[PDB]
Scaffold this active site. Structure first.
Site, PDB file in Angstrom:
ATOM      1  N   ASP A 169       0.764  -1.240   0.000  1.00  0.00           N
ATOM      2  CA  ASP A 169       0.000   0.000   0.000  1.00  0.00           C
ATOM      3  C   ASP A 169       0.788   1.280   0.000  1.00  0.00           C
ATOM      4  O   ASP A 169       1.160   1.816   1.028  1.00  0.00           O
ATOM      5  CB  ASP A 169      -0.895  -0.052   1.229  1.00  0.00           C
ATOM      6  N   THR A 170       0.981   1.931  -1.144  1.00  0.00           N
ATOM      7  CA  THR A 170       1.713   3.188  -1.309  1.00  0.00           C
ATOM      8  C   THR A 170       1.006   4.304  -0.609  1.00  0.00           C
ATOM      9  O   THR A 170       1.615   5.374  -0.402  1.00  0.00           O
ATOM     10  CB  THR A 170       1.799   3.506  -2.823  1.00  0.00           C
ATOM     11  N   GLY A 171      -0.283   4.114  -0.312  1.00  0.00           N
ATOM     12  CA  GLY A 171      -1.066   5.183   0.373  1.00  0.00           C
ATOM     13  C   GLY A 171      -1.083   5.032   1.886  1.00  0.00           C
ATOM     14  O   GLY A 171      -1.842   5.683   2.565  1.00  0.00           O
TER      15      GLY A 171
END
Ligand SMILES: CC[C@H](NC(=O)C[C@H](O)[C@H](CC(C)C)NC(=O)[C@@H](NC(=O)[C@H](Cc1cccc2ccccc12)NC(C)=O)C(C)C)C(=O)N[C@@H](Cc1cccc2ccccc12)C(N)=O
EC number: 3.4.23.16
Lengths: 99, 99
Positions: A25-27
């Site tokens: 998850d880059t967020g």
């Protein structure tokens, strides 16, 4: 590896002798995992999400094998709906975004 | 470009005549933006986050330019703290994850 995004980006992780599936998850600025059996001294923290804020236990210096690659860092344990690998360990496995 | 994850992966987007900044989020199935005047009609939808759920308005066939690349897709508007580009639009710009 290179991962396209037509499906959620899930990987197999090993932590604390246990095997789980977790979402890259880059967020997520941090890593948060469902409630699980982990040893040591932990501390409260609270992180925000889309549906509101949640209460979590921070464990530091936790070894994780992500897609059978090693990383040592802080892991948060709590009532997340999914196991999430966040930016604090994605940088360690050298992961990049590319378009 | 190649985006490393030491800082949040933020990008400039152009939607409905307005310029905003949004997060490239591989952990989001859908694109959810902050409340904003969006030309049109919509069907209701609810998405799940870390804090629980949220009630959002879903618009289809919305044009968005993300870092200078055009994509047409469904966009969600509502209570998010940050504008988020989710995998329904990340696959249209050719975005991949690499490690
Ligand atoms: C937004 C749509 C949704 N995805 C998601 O929520 C996942 C997505 O990566 C989100 C974006 C975030 C930016 C809103 N990432 C996170 O929540 C992470 N938070 C931070 O990194 C924050 C940010 C943040 C920064 C500053 C202020 C904040 C104030 C409030 C809230 C967050 C804030 N820092 C912290 C320290 O708290 C957690 C993992 C630490 C999604 O795809 N929902 C699906 C599938 C699904 C269902 C149910 C639960 C899910 C849980 C996670 C992922 C997917 C989930 C759906 N169909 O509803």
């Amino acid at each position: 590896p290179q991962v396209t995004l037509w499906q959620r980006p899930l990987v197999t992780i090993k932590i604390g002798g246990q095997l789980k599936e977790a979402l890259l998850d880059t967020g997520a600025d941090d890593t948060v995992l469902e409630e699980m059996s982990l040893p040591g001294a932990w501390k409260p923290k609270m992180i925000g999400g889309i549906g509101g804020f949640i209460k979590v236990r921070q464990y530091d210096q936790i070894l994780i094998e992500i897609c059978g690659h090693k990383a040592i860092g802080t892991v948060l344990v709590g009532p997340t709906p999914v196991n999430i690998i966040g930016r604090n360990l994605l940088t360690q496995i050298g992961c990049t975004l590319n378009f």
